[PDB]
Amino acid sequence: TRECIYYNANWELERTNQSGLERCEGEQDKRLHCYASWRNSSGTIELVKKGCWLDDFNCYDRQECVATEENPQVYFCCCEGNFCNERFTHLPEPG
Amino acid sequence: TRECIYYNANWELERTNQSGLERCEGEQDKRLHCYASWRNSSGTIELVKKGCWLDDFNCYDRQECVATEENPQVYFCCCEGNFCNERFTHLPEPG
Amino acid sequence: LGLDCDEHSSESRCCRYPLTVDFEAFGWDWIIAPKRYKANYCSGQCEYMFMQKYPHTHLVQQANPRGSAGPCCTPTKMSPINMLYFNDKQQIIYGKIPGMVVDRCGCS
Amino acid sequence: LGLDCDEHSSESRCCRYPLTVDFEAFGWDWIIAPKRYKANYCSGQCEYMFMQKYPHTHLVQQANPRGSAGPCCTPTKMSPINMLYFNDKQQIIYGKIPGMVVDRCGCS
Amino acid sequence: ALQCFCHLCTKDNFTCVTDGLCFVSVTETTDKVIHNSMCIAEIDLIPRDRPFVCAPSSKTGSVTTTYCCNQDHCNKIELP
Amino acid sequence: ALQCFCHLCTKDNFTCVTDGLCFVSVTETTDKVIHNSMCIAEIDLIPRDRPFVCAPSSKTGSVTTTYCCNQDHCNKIELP
Ligand SMILES: *[C@@H]1O[C@H](CO)[C@@H](O)[C@H](O)[C@H]1NC(C)=O
Ligand SMILES: *[C@@H]1O[C@H](CO)[C@@H](O)[C@H](O)[C@H]1NC(C)=O
Ligand SMILES: *[C@@H]1O[C@H](CO)[C@@H](O)[C@H](O)[C@H]1NC(C)=O
Numbered sequence: 001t002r003e004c005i006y007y008n009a010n011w012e013l014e015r016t017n018q019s020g021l022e023r024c025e026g027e028q029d030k031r032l033h034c035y036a037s038w039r040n041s042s043g044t045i046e047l048v049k050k051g052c053w054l055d056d057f058n059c060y061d062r063q064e065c066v067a068t069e070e071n072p073q074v075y076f077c078c079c080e081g082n083f084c085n086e087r088f089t090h091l092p093e094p095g
Numbered sequence: 096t097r098e099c100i101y102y103n104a105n106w107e108l109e110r111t112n113q114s115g116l117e118r119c120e121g122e123q124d125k126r127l128h129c130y131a132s133w134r135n136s137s138g139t140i141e142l143v144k145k146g147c148w149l150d151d152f153n154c155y156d157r158q159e160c161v162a163t164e165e166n167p168q169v170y171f172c173c174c175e176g177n178f179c180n181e182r183f184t185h186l187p188e189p190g
Numbered sequence: 191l192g193l194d195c196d197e198h199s200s201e202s203r204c205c206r207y208p209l210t211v212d213f214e215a216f217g218w219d220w221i222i223a224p225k226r227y228k229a230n231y232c233s234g235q236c237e238y239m240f241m242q243k244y245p246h247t248h249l250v251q252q253a254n255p256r257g258s259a260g261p262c263c264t265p266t267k268m269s270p271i272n273m274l275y276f277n278d279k280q281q282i283i284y285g286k287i288p289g290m291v292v293d294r295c296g297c298s
Numbered sequence: 299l300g301l302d303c304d305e306h307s308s309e310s311r312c313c314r315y316p317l318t319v320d321f322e323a324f325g326w327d328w329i330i331a332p333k334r335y336k337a338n339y340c341s342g343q344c345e346y347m348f349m350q351k352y353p354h355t356h357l358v359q360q361a362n363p364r365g366s367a368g369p370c371c372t373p374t375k376m377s378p379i380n381m382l383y384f385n386d387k388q389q390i391i392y393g394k395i396p397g398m399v400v401d402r403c404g405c406s
Numbered sequence: 407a408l409q410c411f412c413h414l415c416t417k418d419n420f421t422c423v424t425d426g427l428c429f430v431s432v433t434e435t436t437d438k439v440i441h442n443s444m445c446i447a448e449i450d451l452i453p454r455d456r457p458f459v460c461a462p463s464s465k466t467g468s469v470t471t472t473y474c475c476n477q478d479h480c481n482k483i484e485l486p
Numbered sequence: 487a488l489q490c491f492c493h494l495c496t497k498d499n500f501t502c503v504t505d506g507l508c509f510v511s512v513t514e515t516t517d518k519v520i521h522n523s524m525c526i527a528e529i530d531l532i533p534r535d536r537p538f539v540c541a542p543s544s545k546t547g548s549v550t551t552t553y554c555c556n557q558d559h560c561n562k563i564e565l566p
């Protein structure tokens with residue numbers, strides 16, 4: 001199984017909790033992940049969404065949530081581990 | 096929709112009603128039928144089973160339940176219509 | 191919603207054709223009813239953007255070049271049939287047999 | 299349970315091979331994540347009595363002669379993926395997209 | 407119930423009806439320009455808020471412009 | 487967990503494991519005698535009380551004898 005940090009900056013209009021935990025329901029073979037998404041403009045971090053993330057090989061064997069895209073509009077990271085998406089950074093690859 | 100006569104000569108061990116009606120649940124396109132099955136040895140008719148029957152082109156456009164097999168071990172007929180399986184006969188084809 | 195075909199059609203694309211499966215032709219006398227039923231089958235060419243079954247089909251067909259092989263004409267909807275038969279314990283059984291009739295055909 | 303294959307295999311039969319669908323290679327920048335995912339595909343020959351998908355497959359393959367064409371190597375199990383993207387109303391959407399990953403391959 | 411042009415529906419007056427949307431696309435190859443038009447059922451618009459099939463795409467030596475709409479006979483090709 | 491002979495499982499020591507049953511068949515053609523052996527998963531035994539795959543069949547110029555069993559390595563061909 002898997003547990004992740006949950007956050008929805010749009011919680012009101014979707015009628016959902018703003019923050020908390022999410023118990024990830026998974027199938028027999030499929031692996032489970034956690035993800036975090038945020039905006040970053042003029043040094044101000046704006047959270048977008050956090051929660052469970054289905055089987056995705058981009059998140060395989062990643063214990064920490066690190067975004068890899070060079071200057072995107074909406075940053076994203078995913079990881080494998082319980083609550084691994086609580087902290088996140090932006091450390092892109094060399095090239 | 097469709098309704099048929101229901102009968103199960105094995106009702107006890109299957110823990111079901113012996114006789115009565117059965118409301119046939121059908122899908123959008125599929126047609127619905129009713130069927131009857133019985134044994135016939137030395138002039139004694141022994142009921143076997145009766146109930147709904149799923150889409151089967153052997154039962155298409157048959158308002159009366161008539162078995163067509165020449166001297167089978169377990170007679171069978173199916174029909175299209177509400178309670179059409181209440182009465183049944185054995186009138187095989189010419190050849 | 192796929193395309194239905196008969197011997198009076200000229201469709202080279204993925205189409206559903208009729209077929210009757212004959213249980214008696216196998217020598218199976220343990221099946222009381224039905225002796226035969228309409229099962230149909232899928233045949234025809236799967237040209238580009240024709241009756242794609244999954245979103246996966248559309249994505250790989252768009253991405254994957256012609257190399258090396260296109261989708262396969264395959265069922266996209268099945269339905270069950272009823273069957274009255276003797277089982278291995280010689281008991282009279284009324285069953286609902288799934289995956290027996292092809293209802294539609296698509297490209298996967 | 300089908301058979302998995304890679305470029306280091308010599309399997310002429312219906313097998314599941316790996317494939318990465320690249321959303322960025324389409325020019326789709328409205329998909330925040332994932333930029334690419336493993337979707338896989340089915341390929342290989344469907345010889346007789348090999349990985350038959352339905353009971354319908356076994357019955358027609360037994361009845362139908364060789365004429366005229368055998369089963370098609372097709373997915374027998376799919377799985378969804380998560381996707382974070384902008385929709386047509388430019389809203390951030392977290393969705394569960396079905397039918398995106400081929401898990402198994404069989405013969406239909 | 408929404409009618410669309412179907413370039414390959416040669417037996418239904420080149421017209422289909424769906425609960426989905428009308429589809430039309432122009433694909434420019436290095437040496438060819440082709441167009442396709444059809445109907446896309448509702449359950450095939452994945453995801454419904456931005457379907458893959460309705461999104462224009464491009465790859466090496468190929469550009470596919472698409473147009474999805476919900477008015478009757480709206481999937482029409484045109485010219486400058 | 488039930489092991490059976492698999493004539494074509496050339497990478498698993500010609501052995502498969504299933505929750506179903508072991509399968510083996512001999513098909514006599516006018517000019518050929520072939521045998522196949524494999525495992526049949528539980529969800530593929532349709533119907534479970536008398537599966538089609540485990541039933542012997544015959545047609546014009548072909549006879550397929552089959553044998554289904556649940557003991558370990560029970561799907562063996564034999565001779566008179
Ligand atoms: C809020 O959190 C609880 C605790 O897990 C969860 O059961 C519930 O589905 C969430 N959403 C709402 C609207 O209560
Ligand atoms: C935020 O964006 C700036 C560039 O404007 C970058 O240097 C910094 O590392 C980013 N930090 C995070 C946590 O995304
Ligand atoms: C008996 O008949 C009733 C009336 O339709 C039905 O609801 C019920 O399922 C049948 N079987 C049993 C065991 O009661």
Ligand SMILES: *[C@@H]1O[C@H](CO)[C@@H](O)[C@H](O)[C@H]1NC(C)=O
Nearest residue numbers: 135136137138170183184185
């Ligand atoms: C019963 O079987 C006899 C033959 O033994 C046949 O002549 C008769 O028509 C059958 N009647 C019914 C109702 O099956």
